[PDB]
């Protein structure tokens, strides 16, 4: 019965079913709860169930200048050590069952308006520590492939800006959402505009622009009319540095346009 | 510079019994690969030329044992996996040996045998005649 055993790596690979044939096309996502626990985390190689104290593993080699013989813990001492060992289990499960915190940009279950952090530094060594970026839109884009069929790829729109008038936007598309986030952060700095801000709080004049199918009407406002604009235009102007603005979007409300 | 002195202390006695004689001593060393057998042949011939035994070396034909097993687990018999076990042989033929010379040769030979090879020692013991055949009449 000893030769019938396998390694914990294959045991978890067979238990969690990460490489299952059902979670490939999309039949899964029902029970999206996958957690693998390492069993050798707090397992000292010296301790055992009998409580033997070996001079080479548990206890030091030389005590009082002499050699240590094979000793065994008492029952109450072994109950104390196993009590500490059991307490470490719930100590770790508490750190596991607790979800760390996120900041909601526009609503509790969206990615628009959330903070993504400063962009990654350049190759030459330039660091963008004053730059702050925000996600404007995340969309699961699908493509029809010959073999696999539906090929889901996340497309993300991310805008960077420092608050002094320099701001830009970019689109990053990748199979993974964090990869698209990084592809958009590191690509938004290459396309940076400079927005002339009258007195660093408003725009110089009321602009009424007509894009492809989007009508934007923005009006210059005094110091008391603070950012009464679309929920994404407010974020873009908060990245630019505009503290007072009124904007009205008519026609299509496509985020990229 | 720190060389020990008087390191050789052997215990060799010469018994009055007649030393045994050997006509032909064949050593057939078998292995899986050829490189270890080649280096071992080089080592054996260099160990025999020093003791002056005039060893002869040739290579017997190899033996390949192959078999066939099923490829899948439950049911797939049209697709099989064939395994192979190669066995190469090396023959070292020694002639005109004595009882202690063959012992001192097989001592330096067998103690230094590799792990993946084995050895078949065939000794041709030399004898004149037994006692009841010299000149008996029933």
């Amino acid at each position: 019965s000893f030769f019938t055993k396998l390694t914990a790596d294959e045991l978890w690979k067979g238990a969690l079913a990460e490489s299952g044939a059902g979670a490939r096309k999309g039949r899964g996502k029902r029970t999206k709860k996958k957690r693998r626990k390492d069993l050798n985390r707090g397992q000292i190689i010296g301790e055992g169930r009998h409580g033997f104290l070996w001079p080479g593993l548990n206890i030091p080699l030389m005590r009082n200048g002499a050699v240590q013989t094979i000793a065994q813990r008492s029952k109450e001492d072994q109950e104390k050590v196993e009590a500490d060992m059991v307490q470490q289990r719930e100590e770790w499960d508490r750190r596991r069952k607790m979800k760390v915190k996120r900041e909601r940009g526009w609503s509790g279950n969206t990615w628009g308006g959330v903070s993504l952090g400063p962009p990654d530094p350049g190759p030459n060594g330039e660091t963008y520590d004053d730059f702050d970026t925000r996600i404007l839109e995340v969309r699961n884009v699908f493509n029809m492939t010959a073999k696999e069929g539906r090929k889901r790829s996340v497309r993300v729109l991310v805008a960077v800006g420092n608050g002094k008038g320099a701001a830009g936007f970019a689109i990053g598309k990748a199979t993974e959402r964090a990869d698209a986030f990084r592809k958009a952060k590191n690509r938004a700095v290459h396309y940076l505009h400079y927005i002339e801000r009258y007195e660093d709080h408003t725009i110089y004049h009321d602009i009424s622009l007509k894009f492809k199918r989007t009508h934007i009407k923005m009006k210059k406002q005094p110091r008391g009319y603070g950012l009464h604009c679309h929920r994404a235009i407010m974020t873009i102007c908060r990245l630019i540095g505009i503290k007072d603005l009124y904007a009205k979007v008519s026609g299509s409300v496509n985020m990229l346009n | 510079v720190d060389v020990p002195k008087d390191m050789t202390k052997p215990e060799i006695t010469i018994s009055d019994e007649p030393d045994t004689l050997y006509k032909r001593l064949s050593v057939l060393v078998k292995g899986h690969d050829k490189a270890v057998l080649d280096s071992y042949e080089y080592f054996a011939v260099l160990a025999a030329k020093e003791l002056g035994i005039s060893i002869k070396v040739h290579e017997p034909p190899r033996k390949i044992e192959r078999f066939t097993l099923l490829k899948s687990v439950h049911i797939f018999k049209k697709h099989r996996v064939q395994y192979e076990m190669r066995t190469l042989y090396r023959c070292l033929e020694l002639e005109h040996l004595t009882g202690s010379t063959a012992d001192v040769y097989l001592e330096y030979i067998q103690r230094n045998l590799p792990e993946g090879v084995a050895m078949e020692v065939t000794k041709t013991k030399l004898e004149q005649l037994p006692e009841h055949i010299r000149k008996p009449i029933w």
Partner: protein
């Protein structure tokens, strides 16, 4: 506290004797071998892996304890155990007229805890019939007494004994067979006259 000690390569002398570090079969520790050897299949843009952490150099049996200098130094101290072969038997023509009895003895070796090999009990006896004191009737009876154990082309009698457990027992039994086959060939019984 972690400690990383450099190997012996930086301390290995260029004229130091090699058999001192590899006296017997060793597992080829890369720290005690000053030769940089690259073993393994290379990468299209890479090179074969170095000796450090190389399982390929650890799978193969190393002959570092059997270099020419070490084998010469070993056999120079082994020259005291062997005896000198008498030159009076340089050719087999004198060996056949002096020692006509040949005893083929088999020996095997195998890696493992057990030593008993059932092929070790086999002892072969080869005697040339042209070297005995057989008369015409003794020879013509001994040929039909042994049968196929004696060949006519080479005229050699072969005894193949495997019944005894021990090799010395099979040897003594083969010599006993030789004695009885030489003796009973001279006894003429009553059924021979017909």
């Amino acid at each position: 506290r972690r400690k990383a000690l450099p190997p012996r390569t930086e301390k290995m002398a260029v004229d130091q004797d090699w058999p001192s570090v590899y006296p017997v079969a060793a597992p080829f520790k890369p720290s005690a071998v000053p030769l940089p050897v690259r073993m393994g299949y290379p990468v299209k843009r890479g090179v074969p892996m170095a000796k450090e952490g190389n399982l390929e150099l650890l799978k193969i049996p190393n002959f570092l304890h059997l270099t020419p200098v070490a084998i010469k130094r070993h056999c120079e101290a082994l020259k005291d155990f062997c005896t000198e072969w008498p030159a009076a038997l340089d050719s087999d023509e004198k060996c056949e007229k002096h020692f006509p009895i040949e005893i083929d003895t088999a020996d095997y070796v195998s890696a493992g805890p057990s030593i008993r090999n059932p092929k070790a009990r086999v002892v072969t006896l080869r005697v040339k019939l042209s070297s005995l004191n057989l008369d015409d009737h003794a020879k013509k009876k001994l040929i039909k007494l042994v049968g196929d154990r004696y060949c006519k082309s080479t005229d050699v009698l072969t005894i193949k004994t495997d019944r005894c457990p021990l090799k010395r027992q099979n040897y003594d039994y083969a010599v006993y067979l030789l004695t009885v086959l030489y003796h009973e060939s001279w006894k003429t019984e009553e059924w021979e006259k017909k």
